[PDB]
């Protein structure tokens, strides 16, 4: 993930709850956002594999999501 669009998003999101961000604070969020996403992509990939696909679909991701 690139820093600049992520940061712009963090700020849009902090604004719907109202503040400034410490730079390590954004980095920690980004590192955590990345682990979360990659983890979901692995589960999504396993659901496709069980359906004998190597192409992941919106429906696969939606299911991996519902299993919160």
């Amino acid at each position: 993930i690139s820093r600049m669009p992520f940061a712009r998003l963090v700020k849009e999101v902090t604004d719907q709850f109202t503040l400034r961000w410490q730079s390590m604070a954004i980095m920690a969020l980004q590192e955590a956002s990345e682990a979360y996403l990659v983890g979901l992509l692995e589960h999504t990939n396993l659901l496709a594999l069980h359906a004998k696909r190597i192409t992941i679909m919106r429906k696969d991701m939606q299911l991996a999501r519902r299993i919160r």
């Binding site: 983890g39 589960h43 069980h50 004998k52 696909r53 192409t55």
Partner: peptide, 30 residues
Amino acid sequence: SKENRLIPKLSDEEVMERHKKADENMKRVW
């Protein structure tokens, strides 16, 4: 696969064990 590429033939159980390893792993990272 349905797209004519070779994929490993995993049993229902091995697939589940992969989900589990994915999770052990993301816990550790977190």
